[PDB]
Amino acid sequence: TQLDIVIVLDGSNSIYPWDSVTAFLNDLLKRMDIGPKQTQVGIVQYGENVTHEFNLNKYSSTEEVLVAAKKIVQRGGAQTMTALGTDTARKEAFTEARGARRGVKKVMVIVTDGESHDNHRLKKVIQDCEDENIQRFSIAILGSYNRGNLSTEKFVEEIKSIASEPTEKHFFNVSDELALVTIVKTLGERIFA
């Protein structure tokens, strides 16, 4: 079965350098066969609000997706609304109106480097994602936290709660931005296999 993939990117300013995120997107995407009858990719960026960078059916080829992924700019933000960004991907990104197809497996990839301001909604948002059979891969970047000498225990536990089970398979603990690209092959093959 094919796959509708929606990448949800935290765009907060603490994430640096943005080139690491786009390099991560490029590497993950270039090894996919994007098409209306193949894999479809949609990308959403969130900070304090949410923005659909491009819908699931916006681009019909891998080359096109790559071009669009490289153009994504960091929108910034002072408070991380992960619940909002995730719920929106479920509510809007994954809709026929934006390209989502029938009889296709839905996959969400969440990338963030901080604890969410609306973490009180995560329980509900996630459960709704589960009821809709959306497989979730969450990635926590401990870069800004470590550099700020902040405790990452709760943060890791929170992003982990977003991941689908097993968990050790859907959750990725990334030490820093430059290390993002090192999970591409594993994540890549897991999204599919």
Q: Where do contacts with Mg ion occur on this chain (CB under 5 A)?
A: 12, 14, 113-114
Cβ proximity to Mg ion, 94 vs 172, nearer residue: 172
* DSSP assigned state of 114: S
**What whole-number distance in Å separates Cα of residue 112 and Cα of residue 94?**
20
Tell me the closest approach of the beta carbon of residue 152 to Mg ion, in angstroms.
Answer: 12
Cβ proximity to Mg ion, 14 vs 39, nearer residue: 14
CB 40 within 8 A of CB 57: yes
Cβ proximity to Mg ion, 14 vs 20, nearer residue: 14
β-pair type (40-46, 3-10): parallel
Tell me the closest approach of the beta carbon of residue 127 to Mg ion, in angstroms.
Answer: 25
Cβ proximity to Mg ion, 85 vs 114, nearer residue: 114
**What whole-number distance in Å separates Cα of residue 127 and Cα of residue 121?**
10
Q: List strand residue ranges (DSSP E) for the chain, in order.
A: 3-10, 40-46, 50-54, 105-112, 134-141, 171-174
CB 73 within 8 A of CB 67: no
Tell me the closest approach of the beta carbon of residue 177 to Mg ion, in angstroms.
Answer: 11
Tell me the closest approach of the beta carbon of residue 147 to Mg ion, in angstroms.
Answer: 11
Tell me the closest approach of the beta carbon of residue 139 to Mg ion, in angstroms.
Answer: 13
CB 111 within 8 A of CB 172: no
CB atoms within 10 A of CB 132: 11
Tokens 């690209």 sit on residue: 181
Cβ proximity to Mg ion, 85 vs 99, nearer residue: 85
Cβ proximity to Mg ion, 16 vs 64, nearer residue: 16
Tell me the closest approach of the beta carbon of residue 77 to Mg ion, in angstroms.
Answer: 7
